[PDB]
Amino acid sequence: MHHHHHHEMEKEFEQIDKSGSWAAIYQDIRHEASDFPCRVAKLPKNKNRNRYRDVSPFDHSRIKLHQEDNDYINASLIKMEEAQRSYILTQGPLPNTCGHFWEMVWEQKSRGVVMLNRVMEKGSLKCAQYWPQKEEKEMIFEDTNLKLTLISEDIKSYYTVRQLELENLTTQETREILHFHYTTWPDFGVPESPASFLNFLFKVRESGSLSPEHGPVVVHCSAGIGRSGTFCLADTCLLLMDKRKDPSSVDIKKVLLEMRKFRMGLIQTADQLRFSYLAVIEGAKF
Ligand SMILES: NC(=O)[C@H](Cc1ccc(C2=CC(=O)NS2(=O)=O)cc1)NC(=O)[C@H](Cc1ccccc1)NC(=O)Cc1ccc(C2=CC(=O)NS2(=O)=O)cc1
Ligand SMILES: CCCCCCCCO[C@@H]1O[C@H](CO)[C@@H](O)[C@H](O)[C@H]1O
Numbered sequence: 121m122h123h124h125h126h127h128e129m130e131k132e133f134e135q136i137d138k139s140g141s142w143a144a145i146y147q148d149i150r151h152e153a154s155d156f157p158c159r160v161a162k163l164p165k166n167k168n169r170n171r172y173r174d175v176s177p178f179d180h181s182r183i184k185l186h187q188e189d190n191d192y193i194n195a196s197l198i199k200m201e202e203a204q205r206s207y208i209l210t211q212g213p214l215p216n217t218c219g220h221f222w223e224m225v226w227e228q229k230s231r232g233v234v235m236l237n238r239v240m241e242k243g244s245l246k247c248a249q250y251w252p253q254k255e256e257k258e259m260i261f262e263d264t265n266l267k268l269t270l271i272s273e274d275i276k277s278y279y280t281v282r283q284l285e286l287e288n289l290t291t292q293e294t295r296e297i298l299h300f301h302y303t304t305w306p307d308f309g310v311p312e313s314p315a316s317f318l319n320f321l322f323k324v325r326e327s328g329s330l331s332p333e334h335g336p337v338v339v340h341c342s343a344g345i346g347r348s349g350t351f352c353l354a355d356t357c358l359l360l361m362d363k364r365k366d367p368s369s370v371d372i373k374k375v376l377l378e379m380r381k382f383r384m385g386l387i388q389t390a391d392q393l394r395f396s397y398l399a400v401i402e403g404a405k406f
Contacts, residue, residue, distance in 0.1 A: 121367045121404065128368045129401045137394070146390035149373055153380045156180055166192045169220070171211045175343040181382045183208055185220060187228045187236045193220045194344070196383035197336065198352060202376075203359040206336040207352050211344040212247025219261035221250055225284060225297065225338055226266060232329025233318060234339040235301045236347040242307065246342035251284060251299055263290055265289040271296075271377050278316045281323065300324050305347050308388055310395040314402040317395075321355060321403070330355070349386030353379060354399040361404055 136142060160166065161176035169192055170176065176194065177183070183195040194217075195210035208228060212235075213221040225233065237324050239247050252259050257270040271283040282299035302320055304312060311317040324330060329337050341347035353376055360375070361367035376393070387393050 121361060123355040125207050125366070125368045126401075126404065129404065133397055133401055136397070142390040142394045145373060146387075146393050149338070149376055149380075151186060151391070152377060153384070154377070155384070156381075160192055161194065162347075163192075165190065169217055170194050171214055172343050175211065175345060175385065177383060181229065183210070183224055185223055187223065187354070193217065193224055195338075196344075198379055198382040200356050200359075200379070203356045203363070204332070205330065205356065205359060208336045208338045209344045209348045209352065209386075210338060210340045212340055212342045213250045215248045217251040218248055219264040219266070221338075222261055222266050222268065222286065223264055224289055226288065226295075228338070229335030230297070230329075230338050231295075231331075232298045232324060232327060232335035232337045233350065234324060234329075234337055234348075235299065235341075236305050236339070236351060237307065237341040238303060241342065244325075247340075251282065260289075262338060278302065278312060279320050279323075298327050300327075300329075302347075305341075307342060308346060308392075310350070310391055314395070314399045317354070317399050318403050318406070321351070321358075321399075322406070325355075343385070345383065346388030346392060349376075349379065349383075349388070350392045353387060353396045355402070356401045357396070358403050361400070367404065370400075372400070 156178040158176035158178055160179050177196040181196045183197055185191040185193055195208055198207045198209055237247055240251050252270040259268045267287040267289055269285045269386040271285055273282045280301045280303055284299055285294050287294045287299050339348045357370050357375055360370050
């Protein structure tokens with residue numbers, strides 16, 4: 121990628137931004153977004169497994185738990201072919217689905233978990249605390265054979281990184297799970313700056329949590345679509361620029377619509393779309 125690519129990219133952002141065109145672009149994405157059945161998510165017995173009735177995983181891409189009783193979890197597999205990366209986007213676990221959440225992490229062989237929301241937002245519980253606190257580092261999930269222990273916790277200004285140990289109580293196998301928690305990303309909003317977001321994304325990448333040597337990273341916010349979608353779109357577009365002969369050929373609208381074939385509503389505001397674009401052009405420099 122040469123300087124002319126950077127030039128066109130930056131000029132384009134400026135042109136879109138100065139004319140406030142994000143609004144129209146975002147509307148077109150919403151208007152063209154695909155729709156597929158969500159029959160399983162809507163089954164009566166799955167009512168208490170969904171945080172929002174208007175946010176469901178499509179049947180074709182939903183993540184199935186390996187258990188036979190009820191394999192449903194509100195989670196979707198976002199598989200980006202050209203970029204060669206898979207992500208699992210899920211809702212913030214409910215108190216009764218924290219076990220399911222870790223069963224998914226175990227079954228999919230994930231190494232990292234990216235959390236982009238806070239436990240309480242706008243006065244209500246938007247995500248059950250599914251990881252241990254300092255005073256009780258050990259957790260055992262009801263109706264599961266999984267134990268979770270907090271090994272380390274590093275609290276920074278805009279995010280916190282944790283090392284966790286997940287253990288299968290039946291086989292005694294233990295695995296290191298990295299928790300990347302962005303603690304200052306407002307609901308329906310954007311990160312404080314492209315720099316903070318990029319530092320976070322790069323930290324996730326450097327850990328190996330996004331490598332094909334491990335299962336798909338699990339990403340979530342409250343509904344698993346707005347902030348989670350922004351995070352994944354930026355990472356994927358960055359991947360495409362590093363792989364393509366001509367990085368300026370990346371079509372952000374096309375890429376987002378492709379991701380939306382896997383999970384509904386990815387990116388919830390025009391400003392989040394704008395931020396994704398900004399994060400990509402800023403990250404392209406690195
Ligand atoms: N759309 C939204 O803002 C959020 C989801 C939403 C939340 C957050 C975000 C995020 C922004 C972000 O930046 N990141 S993010 O976390 O992804 C995006 C979307 N959805 C809602 O608030 C909807 C009510 C609604 C429906 C349609 C349109 C508007 C409101 N509320 C519910 O679904 C609660 C509810 C769930 C099940 C039932 C039930 C029906 C039933 O039949 N039985 S029941 O279980 O009681 C009844 C109520
Ligand atoms: C997510 C980041 C996507 C970056 C895609 C940038 C595509 C640049 O596109 C180019 O921008 C130039 C400057 O306006 C125009 O003159 C060119 O005709 C146009 O093809």
